Design a protein around this nucleic acid. Structure first.
Ligand SMILES: CO[C@@H]1[C@H](O)[C@H](n2cnc3c(=O)nc(N)[nH]c32)O[C@H]1COP(=O)(O)OP(=O)(O)OP(=O)(O)O
Ligand SMILES: [Mg+2]
Ligand SMILES: [Zn+2]
Ligand SMILES: [Zn+2]
Ligand SMILES: [Zn+2]
Lengths: 82, 528, 49, 8, 257, 44, 115, 67, 428, 49
RNA sequence: UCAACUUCAUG
């Protein structure tokens, strides 16, 4: 939905964090460009965690409300659970 | 028939679709390992060599993966297969394949399981979600899965022939999901009862109780040796509690370095006098009971299952709720390591001398038993003379049985209390019961004083023979010995009739367990 | 001849019956073996009461 | 094996 | 800041036993000397067996096990012999090993007790401590055992077959004065053989400034090495381990510089 | 190969596709007899 | 089948260093010596001799895992002293003590015999 | 099956002492006195001879496979 | 006394149990008659005149301990253990490794475990004599310390001495026998034992067929590693199909016996027995005679194990935490009685209801031999040499090696064989 | 074994001296499989004539 | 290198 009228929680849920980190890791392992400057990190999951901490993962989560509507929350917009 | 193929357990719907046999799974016996962390699990080399994880060849890992490919399936840290972009699986086990050893970005090297891999660990039955938890792999010699002892309680696992299943995630996405949703440090506190699932257990619990007593004083070398096993140590030796005449630290002073951050907790030891809180010495507590942790420092107290165990408000629970799950993982591991080395120093044992009581104690137990048997005889005589009158809601038979049971239970309790008074500070039965590591005061009492009444189906031993319990007893004997009361202790040794009656009670318990499993399983399936 | 009845070992109709331990050793049979089982298709089967 | 109120 | 000077007094010396006392030494040094007695004194024992014919009741690897556990005289040449890994020659040679042979057949009716005496060594200095005998197997008539074995130098850390000693008795503070062991009821406890206390006094008075010293050892030989030379070899081997450690440490310090 | 007899303990040589019956005793249980190649056992 | 070979307990595999020295950043003038293929025999001896030294502020040893074969010795010394020097001096002192023990044990042997 | 070489706990050779033990038992010596005469002192070594069951004699009754 | 004296002279007196029955001294009573009979457990305690409970005893038990069966009769001091623990010990004693029969060499039985050095118990029940437990024992007496040493005995596991294990302690042999029958089903289709040929036989495997002899059967004395070809059988194909038998994976044994016979049908039948010597590992399962078992947590060498003043290091260290909840006091009494018996030279009597063997009497006997009354001993820590502050309970206890071993249970799967119907990974 | 009734499995008083109280399998067959006591004998049968 | 069935063991 629009930036206004977003009713879902601003905090990123544990499941969203898990799936975002896994997806970003798989992309990084598939030669995807890395947003953050890795400090000698060669593990895709560690690089994904580092990007999540810096809020530079280029993914927007589409949360489906039970009525069928959807809200698009950017990973940057969401507050990191940890 | 087609219906039978699809119908029940072992049918397609339930036996092949809802659950199914899976690849990348390993089962073996579990043995303890105090040295491993909570999340670490110990994997034999053969299990790790069979199971594989596919890693996409990237520019940053191409050299390492090509080395692994060169090693091959034979050398352990190697690769079993190379999956090309087309999907063709070059096989590294069968023949050198020198032209096909080359790796380019996009290829998938099926490397062997290595240290640091995340694996799900499971024990059957998976009653709750803590029965499947994510563990970080450490490869150790020999053929058993090795897990930390704080993790035994969630799995309901003891190392007496138990086996555990291991499932290896095969994708980075599912590996991250497992790591975040199911890692062992993240599972410490259960949502079922808002209590920690794991706590200090077995040897470490008893040794913590002993370590945190006021008496424990540690010299310089022992202090250094124990600080060697504290991973979170800042490298600074605390100033000893007793500087002169000789520098001596205290067990509490060293345990204060284990407690992370600044954690505030107040608990009470199991042997806390109820009078102390009301009366004077509230904050002095002559027995060193109570437990006060201020600013992450154990100011006073002796730790037991109430402080370091699986209960709400414990030091473990407060650490999880305040410092986080990673620091709590370190907390568990450090407790186990340094307290297990101090236990190497102090030592622990169980012997016959623990079961033996004073001669006066044995005399008092015998006198209590004699008085109880005499009171039961008096009750039986009242009933025979028809003096007894039924209790409201009960028949004369039921009220007589209740009176006799009350007399016998009160005598049993009094003998147990005498036995427990007999116990010394050095007694090791008492040590394990006080720490909460194992045993109960009931067990101590049965060991030392009186095994107690043997009851089947909620009643004393029934008249299985015609109007008598065993052929050795006369007909219509309702006295304590006839109907099952065992006055001898386990140490003393049960007499033959007491032995048979004790066997009857044990058989009832075993039948209860065996029958229970299936009904509870059906209920759980229905609820889920 | 109407049939063949399996013979319980060390029973009265077994060949091992009434043989001293030396004779049992000559036949490669243990003196301590209790008997009480049948050899059917080469496997020892015990009737359970 | 203890009493009527305990365990068998 | 320097090592203490230890003193030794030997109380008993018999072909099977050495009872001695070491004074003015640390507990760690004493315990590690005992540890080296058990595990790090080199000895000679059979580690390669090739059984040409075994018709005995015991299977081949049972026979090999029993042969390995048989002690062999290793008094002098164990220091001369090299480890098989060190020796340049492939497999085994006179410098790295000693060859034994067993060829026994029970032709007679009476049971033949194959003993360690039947093992015949190619070098006279190593013999199976025969100079009864260890029983390898009993052979019924018509049963034969033929085998060749090679005995190599090794120490008890590899395998217990290479333990040079039977029981190392180590005691310190015979009367509990450092309170390293706290007796719940001191009187019930038997006095030590080295105890100097009167019969009335169960424990010596607590010595706050005391340190474990005056360690008492009883080293029993398995017969392969003389009990004196077990102790001498242990001291020398511990010194050699420390010297190798020092050499590697010096090399790594130089590398860091 | 050469098969040792179960009962009379006399080696008899039986060709392939030949009935397993020892000459001079008739016993029908033979044993294959130990191999010529030798296996090394570590005494451990 | 997963049983490690016995020689692994004391034999260095190719490319393994007997001693590796890593400084400890948490504290000034501290070091951590990792000895491979060694056990409590050497560790306890060295820790005790280091404790005897007055300029050694901390000395400890640990076996990180019983199944594996390694010894970690943390040594912290006072300023104007080096932990590496303390380790070398400990080793030399232990060597001297053992040599004196050998000489006196030989003399005791020769006197118990022959009189 | 046969007397073990070396006591399990300590390693003193007990394999050479079984025939002497049996002979001393035939003489008149009680089990404890025979064990003392053989020189077995620690209860670990005395367990080896005292609890040993010699099955090799029963196994030798069966005829050898090859004669 | 006349009957007992004649039975005591049983042989060369031609007096037996049947003469005892014929005299009218003993009588067989079934349950229905047991309902109508007044019994005395013991003659002296019950028949003799006292405060008169019953003066109409019609029968007397020969001995109470006979109420137990074969497996529970081996339990020493069973009246001092909790009842479920005796059931557990019955179950586990059915699983202990020993010499199962003396003719084990002749028999070719699949899955036969035989122990190297079985020992008779130092603490034994009298009824064991009639179970032939002395003749064919299962288990070894072992110096056992009940102590918490390094945490590897925690829960129910057991620390073991590696040196003792290296000297023969609980070493076993596992024999696996494989049967294969050549048979002719079709008139032109037959199975023949032969060494398969790569070209002649269509079906083959990577597995080495060289070890097969000319007849197609491995000769005894040949080491066979997992997946090698024990028996080579080829079927004529109406060129040939390979039905050769292979070793069970990870068997890793040496061939013991190869027998070639003719079955009832007249076809050639071959049985091949493989020896695998199994040394105790740190997964194998060991249990006492009192219903408490455990896997080997770790193995420490004699230098590492705690030692007494005399130099004795425990063969087995069990966690103290096992004892309290299970209340198997018979274990502690058996350690004390074993210590007394081993020092005395006798064999201890652990009959269930002796009434002449108190724990106090055993303690007083142990005091005479120079040890602590209750069996505790001052142990010295193996690693540091310092005396352990808590004196530790040590004694000779009989331990059994159960058939459950880790090598048989370890398993792993990675894209292996798959079923036809479900196309899902297989089972087993 | 499927029946969960805890009546047929329990150690009856009449089992004294004739079936071992301790020795029973554990699982679905607790108390349903039993073992003879050491001195127990089972009648072989006789003619009532 | 099949599948059904049974029984026996392990938690
Ligand atoms: C503690 O609970 C466990 C589990 O619940 C699991 N388990 C075991 N058998 C079954 C079964 O048939 N069916 C299902 N569903 N689960 C089962 O085993 C239970 C205990 O059994 P036990 O009581 O014998 O454990 P000891 O107390 O005996 O342990 P020692 O001292 O021997 O090591
Ligand atoms: Mg268990
Ligand atoms: Zn050479
Ligand atoms: Zn013949
Ligand atoms: Zn011994």
């Amino acid at each position: 939905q629009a930036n206004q009228k977003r009713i879902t929680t601003p905090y990123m849920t544990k499941y969203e964090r898990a799936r975002v980190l896994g997806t970003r890791a798989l992309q990084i392992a598939m030669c995807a460009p890395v947003m953050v400057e890795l400090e000698g990190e060669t593990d895709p999951l560690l690089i994904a965690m580092k990007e999540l901490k810096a809020r530079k993962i280029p993914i927007i989560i589409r949360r489906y409300l039970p009525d069928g509507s959807y809200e698009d929350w950017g990973v940057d917009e969401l507050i990191i659970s940890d | 028939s087609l219906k039978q193929r699809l119908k029940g357990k072992e049918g397609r719907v339930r036996g092949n679709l809802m659950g199914k046999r899976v690849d990348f799974s390993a089962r073996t016996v579990i043995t303890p390992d105090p040295n491993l962390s909570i999340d670490q699990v110990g994997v034999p080399r053969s299990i790790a060599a069979n199971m594989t994880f596919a890693e996409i060849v990237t520019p940053f890992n191409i050299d390492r993966l090509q080395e692994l490919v060169r090693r091959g399936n034979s050398q352990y840290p190697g690769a079993k297969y190379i999956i090309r972009d087309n999907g063709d699986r070059i096989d590294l086990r069968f023949h050198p394949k020198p032209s096909d050893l080359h790796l380019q970005t996009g290829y998938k090297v099926e490397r062997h399981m290595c240290d640091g891999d995340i694996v799900i660990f499971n024990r059957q039955p998976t009653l709750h979600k803590m029965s499947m938890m994510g563990h970080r792999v450490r490869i150790l010699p020999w053929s058993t899965f090795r897990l930390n002892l704080s993790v035994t309680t969630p799995y309901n696992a003891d190392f007496d022939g138990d086996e555990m299943n291991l499932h290896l995630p095969q994708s980075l996405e599912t590996r991250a999901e497992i790591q975040e949703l199911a890692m062992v440090p993240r599972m410490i506190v259960t949502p079922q009862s808002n209590r920690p699932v794991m706590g200090i257990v077995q040897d470490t619990l008893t040794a913590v109780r002993k370590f945190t007593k006021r008496d424990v004083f540690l010299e310089r070398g022992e202090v250094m040796n124990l600080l060697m096993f504290l991973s979170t140590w800042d490298g600074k030796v605390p100033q000893p509690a007793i500087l002169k005449p000789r520098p001596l630290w205290t067990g509490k002073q060293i345990f204060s370095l284990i407690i992370p951050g600044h954690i505030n907790c107040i608990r009470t030891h199991s042997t806390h006098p109820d009078d102390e809180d009301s009366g004077p010495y509230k904050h002095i507590s002559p027995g060193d009971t109570k437990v006060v942790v201020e600013n992450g420092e154990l100011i006073m107290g002796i730790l037991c299952k109430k402080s370091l165990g699986t209960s709400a408000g414990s030091l473990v629970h407060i650490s999880y709720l305040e410092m986080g799950h990673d620091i709590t993982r370190l907390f568990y591991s450090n407790i186990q390591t340094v307290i297990n080395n101090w236990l190497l120093i102090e030592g622990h044992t169980i012997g016959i001398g623990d079961s033996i009581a004073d001669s006066k104690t044995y005399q008092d137990i015998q006198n209590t038993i004699k008085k109880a048997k005499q009171d039961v005889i008096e009750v039986i005589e009242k009933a025979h003379n028809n003096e007894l009158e039924p209790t409201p809601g009960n028949t004369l038979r039921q009220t007589f049985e209740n009176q006799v049971n009350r007399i016998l239970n009160d005598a049993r309790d009094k003998t147990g209390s005498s036995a427990q008074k007999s116990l010394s500070e050095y007694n090791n039965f008492k040590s394990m019961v006080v720490s909460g590591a194992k045993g109960s005061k009931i067990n101590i009492s049965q060991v030392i004083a009186v095994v107690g009444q043997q009851n089947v189906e909620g009643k004393r031993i029934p008249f299985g023979f015609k109007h008598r319990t065993l052929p050795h007893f006369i007909k219509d004997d309702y006295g304590p010995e006839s109907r099952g009361f065992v006055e001898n202790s386990y140490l003393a040794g049960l007499t033959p009739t007491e032995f048979f009656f004790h066997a009857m009670g044990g058989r009832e318990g075993l039948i209860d367990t065996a029958v229970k499993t299936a009904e509870t399983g059906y209920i759980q399936r229905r609820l889920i | 001849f109407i049939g063949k009845i399996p013979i319980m070992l060390r029973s009265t109709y077994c060949l091992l019956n009434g043989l001293t331990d030396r004779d049992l050793c000559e036949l490669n049979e243990c003196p301590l073996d209790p008997g009480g089982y049948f050899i059917i298709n080469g496997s020892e089967k015990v009737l359970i009461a | 094996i203890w009493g009527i109120g305990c365990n068998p | 800041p320097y090592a203490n000077q230890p003193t030794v007094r030997i109380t008993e010396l018999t072909d099977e036993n050495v009872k001695f006392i070491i004074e003015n030494t640390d507990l760690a040094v004493a315990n590690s000397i005992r540890r080296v007695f058990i595990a790090e004194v080199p000895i000679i024992a059979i580690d390669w067996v090739q059984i040409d014919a075994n018709s005995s009741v015991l299977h081949d690897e049972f026979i090999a096990h029993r042969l390995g556990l048989i002690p062999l005289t290793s008094d002098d040449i164990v220091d001369k012999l090299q480890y098989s890994r060190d020796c340049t020659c492939e497999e085994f040679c006179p410098e790295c090993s000693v060859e034994f042979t067993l060829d026994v057949r029970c032709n007679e009716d009476q049971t033949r007790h194959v003993t360690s005496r039947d093992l015949i060594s190619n070098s006279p200095r190593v013999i199976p401590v025969t100079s009864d005998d260890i029983l390898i197997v009993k052979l019924r008539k018509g049963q034969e055992l033929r085998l060749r074995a090679y005995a190599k130098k090794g120490f008890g850390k590899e395998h217990a077959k290479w333990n040079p000693t039977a029981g190392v008795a180590f005691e310190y503070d015979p009367d509990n004065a450092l309170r390293h062991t706290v007796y719940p009821k001191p009187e019930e406890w038997p006095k030590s053989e080295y105890s100097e206390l009167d019969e009335d006094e169960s424990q010596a008075p607590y010595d706050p400034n005391g340190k474990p010293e005056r360690f008492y050892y009883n080293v029993e030989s398995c017969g392969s090495l003389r009990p004196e030379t077990i102790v001498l070899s242990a001291l020398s081997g511990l010194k050699k381990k420390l010297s190798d450690l020092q050499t590697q440490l010096s090399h790594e310090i130089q590398s860091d510089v | 190969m050469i098969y040792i007899c179960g009962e009379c303990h006399t080696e008899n040589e039986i060709k392939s596709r030949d009935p397993i019956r020892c000459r001079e005793c008739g016993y029908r249980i033979m044993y294959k007899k130990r191999t010529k190649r030798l296996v090394v056992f570590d005494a451990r | 089948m997963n049983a490690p070979p016995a020689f692994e307990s004391f034999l260095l595999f190719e490319g393994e260093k007997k001693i590796t020295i890593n400084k400890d950043t948490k504290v000034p003038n501290a070091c951590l010596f990792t000895i491979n293929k060694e056990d409590h025999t050497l560790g306890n001896i060295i820790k005790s001799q280091l404790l005897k030294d007055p300029q050694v502020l901390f000395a400890g040893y640990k076996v990180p895992h019983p199944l594996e074969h390694k010894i970690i010795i943390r040594v912290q010394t006072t300023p104007d002293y080096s932990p590496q020097e303390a380790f070398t001096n400990a080793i030399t002192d232990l060597i001297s003590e053992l040599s004196l023990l050998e000489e006196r044990f030989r003399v005791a042997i020769k006197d118990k015999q022959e009189g | 099956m046969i007397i073990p070489v070396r006591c399990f706990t300590c390693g003193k050779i007990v394999g050479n002492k079984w025939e002497a033990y049996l002979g001393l038992l035939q003489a008149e010596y009680t089990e404890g006195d025979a064990l003392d005469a053989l020189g077995l002192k620690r209860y670990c070594c005395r367990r080896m001879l005292l609890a040993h069951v010699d099955l090799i004699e029963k196994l030798l009754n069966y005829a050898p496979l090859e004669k | 006394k006349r009957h007992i004296d004649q039975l005591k002279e049983r042989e060369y007196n031609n007096y037996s149990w049947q003469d005892l029955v014929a005299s009218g001294v003993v009588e067989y009573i079934d349950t229905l008659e047991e309902e109508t009979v007044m019994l005395a457990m013991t003659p002296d305690d019950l028949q003799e005149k006292e405060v008169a409970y019953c003066s109409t005893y019609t029968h007397c038990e020969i001995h109470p301990s006979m109420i137990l069966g074969v497996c529970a009769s081996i339990i020493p001091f069973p009246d001092h253990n909790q009842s479920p623990r005796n059931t557990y010990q019955s179950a586990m004693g059915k699983q202990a490794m020993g010499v199962y029969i003396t003719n084990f060499h002749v028999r070719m039985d699949t899955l036969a475990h035989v122990l190297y050095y079985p020992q008779k118990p130092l603490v034994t029940t009298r009824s064991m004599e009639y179970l032939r437990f002395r003749e064919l024992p299962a288990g070894i007496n072992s110096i056992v310390a009940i102590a918490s040493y390094t945490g590897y005995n925690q829960e129910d596991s057991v620390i073991m001495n590696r040196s003792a294990v290296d000297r023969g302690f609980f070493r076993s042999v596992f024999y696996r026998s494989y049967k294969e029958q050549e048979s002719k089903k079709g008139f032109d289709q037959e199975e023949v034992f032969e060494k398969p040929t790569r070209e002649t036989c269509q079906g083959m495997r990577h597995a080495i067929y060289d070890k097969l002899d000319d007849d197609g059967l491995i000769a005894p004395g040949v080491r066979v590693s997992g997946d090698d070809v024990i028996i080579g059988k080829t079927v004529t194909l109406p060129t040939k199909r390979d039905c050769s038998t292979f070793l069970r994976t990870s068997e890793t044994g040496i061939v013991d016996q190869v027998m070639v016979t003719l079955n009832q049908e007249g076809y050639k039948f071959c049985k091949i027995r493989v020896r695998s010597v199994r040394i105790p590992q740190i997964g194998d399962k060991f249990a006492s005679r009192h219903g408490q078992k455990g896997t080997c947590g770790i193995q420490y060498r004699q230098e590492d194990m705690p030692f007494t003043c005399e130099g004795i290091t425990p063969d087995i260290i069990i966690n103290p935490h096992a004892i309290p909840s299970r209340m198997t006091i018979g274990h502690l009494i058996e350690c004390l009685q074993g210590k007394v018996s081993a020092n005395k030279g006798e064999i201890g009597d652990a009959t269930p209801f002796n009434d002449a063997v108190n724990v106090q009497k055993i303690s007083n006997l142990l005091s005479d031999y120079g040890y602590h009354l209750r069996g505790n001993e001052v142990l010295y820590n193996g690693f540091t040499g310092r005396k352990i502050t808590s004196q530790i309970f040590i004694g000779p206890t009989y331990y059994q090696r159960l058939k459950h071993m880790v090598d048989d249970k370890i398993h792993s799967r990675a894209r292996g064989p798959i079923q036809i119907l479900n196309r899902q990974p297989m089972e087993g | 074994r499927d029946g969960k009734l805890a009546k047929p499995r329990q150690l009856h008083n009449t089992l004294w001296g004739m079936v071992c109280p301790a020795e029973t399998p554990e699982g679905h067959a607790v108390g349903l499989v039993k073992n003879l006591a050491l001195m127990a004998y089972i009648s072989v049968g006789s003619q009532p004539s």
